[PDB]
Design a protein around this motif. Sequence first.
Motif, PDB file in Angstrom:
ATOM      1  N   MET A 181       4.933  -1.876  -7.901  1.00  0.00           N
ATOM      2  CA  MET A 181       5.655  -3.082  -7.507  1.00  0.00           C
ATOM      3  C   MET A 181       5.622  -4.071  -8.667  1.00  0.00           C
ATOM      4  O   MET A 181       4.593  -4.691  -8.935  1.00  0.00           O
ATOM      5  N   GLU A 185      -9.048   5.712   2.746  1.00  0.00           N
ATOM      6  CA  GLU A 185      -7.848   5.048   2.257  1.00  0.00           C
ATOM      7  C   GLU A 185      -6.697   6.035   2.085  1.00  0.00           C
ATOM      8  O   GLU A 185      -5.557   5.737   2.441  1.00  0.00           O
ATOM      9  N   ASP A 192      -3.855  -3.880   0.705  1.00  0.00           N
ATOM     10  CA  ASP A 192      -5.233  -4.323   0.884  1.00  0.00           C
ATOM     11  C   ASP A 192      -6.036  -3.974  -0.366  1.00  0.00           C
ATOM     12  O   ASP A 192      -6.408  -2.820  -0.567  1.00  0.00           O
ATOM     13  N   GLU A 206       3.059   3.467  -5.306  1.00  0.00           N
ATOM     14  CA  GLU A 206       4.334   2.964  -5.792  1.00  0.00           C
ATOM     15  C   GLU A 206       4.085   1.712  -6.623  1.00  0.00           C
ATOM     16  O   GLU A 206       3.268   0.869  -6.252  1.00  0.00           O
TER      17      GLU A 206
HETATM   18  C1  DZC Z   1      -1.670  -1.341  -3.034  1.00  0.00           C
HETATM   19  C2  DZC Z   1      -3.054  -0.962  -3.537  1.00  0.00           C
HETATM   20  C3  DZC Z   1      -3.223  -0.893  -4.912  1.00  0.00           C
HETATM   21  C4  DZC Z   1      -2.018  -1.235  -5.761  1.00  0.00           C
HETATM   22  C5  DZC Z   1      -1.060  -1.522  -6.424  1.00  0.00           C
HETATM   23  C6  DZC Z   1       0.141  -1.917  -7.261  1.00  0.00           C
HETATM   24  C7  DZC Z   1       1.196  -1.344  -7.233  1.00  0.00           C
HETATM   25  N1  DZC Z   1       2.125  -1.826  -8.033  1.00  0.00           N
HETATM   26  C8  DZC Z   1       1.285  -2.979  -8.601  1.00  0.00           C
HETATM   27  C9  DZC Z   1       1.533  -3.972  -9.510  1.00  0.00           C
HETATM   28  N2  DZC Z   1       0.518  -4.848  -9.784  1.00  0.00           N
HETATM   29  C10 DZC Z   1      -0.713  -4.736  -9.162  1.00  0.00           C
HETATM   30  C11 DZC Z   1      -0.959  -3.711  -8.227  1.00  0.00           C
HETATM   31  N3  DZC Z   1       0.030  -2.872  -7.977  1.00  0.00           N
HETATM   32  C12 DZC Z   1      -4.443  -0.558  -5.474  1.00  0.00           C
HETATM   33  C13 DZC Z   1      -5.512  -0.264  -4.642  1.00  0.00           C
HETATM   34  C14 DZC Z   1      -5.353  -0.319  -3.255  1.00  0.00           C
HETATM   35  C15 DZC Z   1      -4.125  -0.648  -2.695  1.00  0.00           C
HETATM   36  C16 DZC Z   1      -4.052  -0.737  -1.163  1.00  0.00           C
HETATM   37  O1  DZC Z   1      -3.292  -1.543  -0.654  1.00  0.00           O
HETATM   38  N4  DZC Z   1      -4.945   0.046  -0.341  1.00  0.00           N
HETATM   39  C17 DZC Z   1      -4.995  -0.050   1.098  1.00  0.00           C
HETATM   40  C18 DZC Z   1      -6.165   0.321   1.706  1.00  0.00           C
HETATM   41  C19 DZC Z   1      -6.325   0.240   3.073  1.00  0.00           C
HETATM   42  N5  DZC Z   1      -7.456   0.613   3.673  1.00  0.00           N
HETATM   43  C20 DZC Z   1      -7.933  -0.339   4.412  1.00  0.00           C
HETATM   44  C21 DZC Z   1      -9.366  -0.696   4.109  1.00  0.00           C
HETATM   45  N6  DZC Z   1      -9.575  -0.716   2.815  1.00  0.00           N
HETATM   46  C22 DZC Z   1     -10.764  -1.178   2.558  1.00  0.00           C
HETATM   47  C23 DZC Z   1      -9.425   0.476   2.276  1.00  0.00           C
HETATM   48  C24 DZC Z   1      -8.297   1.275   2.928  1.00  0.00           C
HETATM   49  C25 DZC Z   1      -5.285  -0.246   3.860  1.00  0.00           C
HETATM   50  C26 DZC Z   1      -4.064  -0.656   3.277  1.00  0.00           C
HETATM   51  C27 DZC Z   1      -2.927  -1.196   4.127  1.00  0.00           C
HETATM   52  F1  DZC Z   1      -1.748  -0.765   3.651  1.00  0.00           F
HETATM   53  F2  DZC Z   1      -3.095  -0.788   5.393  1.00  0.00           F
HETATM   54  F3  DZC Z   1      -2.954  -2.536   4.080  1.00  0.00           F
HETATM   55  C28 DZC Z   1      -3.944  -0.554   1.872  1.00  0.00           C
END
Ligand code: DZC
Length: 281
Positions: free
Chosen positions: A93, A61, A158, A91
């Motif tokens: 949100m 991640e 995600d 960040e």
């Molecule tokens: C944003 C986020 C958070 C957050 C946040 C956040 C920020 N402010 C607020 C306000 N209220 C709730 C949440 N808040 C926490 C854990 C994981 C992630 C995340 O989005 N992690 C990610 C992982 C992958 N990977 C893909 C496969 N996964 C299994 C793991 C890794 C791909 C992508 C993507 F960006 F590509 F979508 C994102």
Amino acid sequence: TYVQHIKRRDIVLKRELGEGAFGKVFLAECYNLSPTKDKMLVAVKALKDPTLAARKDFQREAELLTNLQHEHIVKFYGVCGDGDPLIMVFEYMKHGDLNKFLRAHGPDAGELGLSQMLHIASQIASGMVYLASQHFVHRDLATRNCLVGANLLVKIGDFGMSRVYSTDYYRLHTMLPIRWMPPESIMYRKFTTESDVWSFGVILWEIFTYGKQPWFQLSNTEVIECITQGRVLERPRVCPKEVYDVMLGCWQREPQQRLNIKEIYKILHALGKATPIYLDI
Ligand SMILES: Cc1c(C#Cc2cnc3cnccn23)cccc1C(=O)Nc1cc(N2CCN(C)CC2)cc(C(F)(F)F)c1
């Protein structure tokens, strides 16, 4: 790649927001991060006593979000050093996930105008255009996995399944978001940019139904059968025909016949009476 190193001493937790399969997520403040080094709001994911598998997922991640850089992909600040717990910083949100945001503005809860709905959709489409350009297949695109910030800023993330009861995932091994998946993904585990496009069509449906669950009237078994037999989600009453036609373009049974996300972004832009102007000054 190299990931930005954040010192544990610079992070101050404020409020627990929830927990997924990869640890608790917090609202926090972080020092020495902003260009002025003054404290700023961030989101922190903490992984306590991680298994080997959890550790590898944490690393995957961190590397992925370091490489994935775009205005409509969730912004990643870095990680702390090795230890317990493992800490990842995002960040913040301030309006949370998009599904709850949509429901909060819905009739069941003022409301969202056509322009606002199209802006939300366009931003997600923009993020997906970038993902497609990086040959990244998301596989779990849904409003629950999008975040909302100031000025209706929407970014793709995600979070996975909540650690809180949910009906969005079903064991078909792995928990799958079947209500957002195309026939070939359910039947043959084929995940592509084309299956992501299908999921975007469902996102459009979510938006214009104010975050209602796709196939809410169907059990998981009935959903699988329905998607397999080629039935599609019905047009919401408040959905313009052109928007529903975009959904239908996403829901071609033959994956190669589906609109690509670049085409979808152009269409959504053309559909807006006064779509927002993007600036970097
Ligand atoms: C944003 C986020 C958070 C957050 C946040 C956040 C920020 N402010 C607020 C306000 N209220 C709730 C949440 N808040 C926490 C854990 C994981 C992630 C995340 O989005 N992690 C990610 C992982 C992958 N990977 C893909 C496969 N996964 C299994 C793991 C890794 C791909 C992508 C993507 F960006 F590509 F979508 C994102």
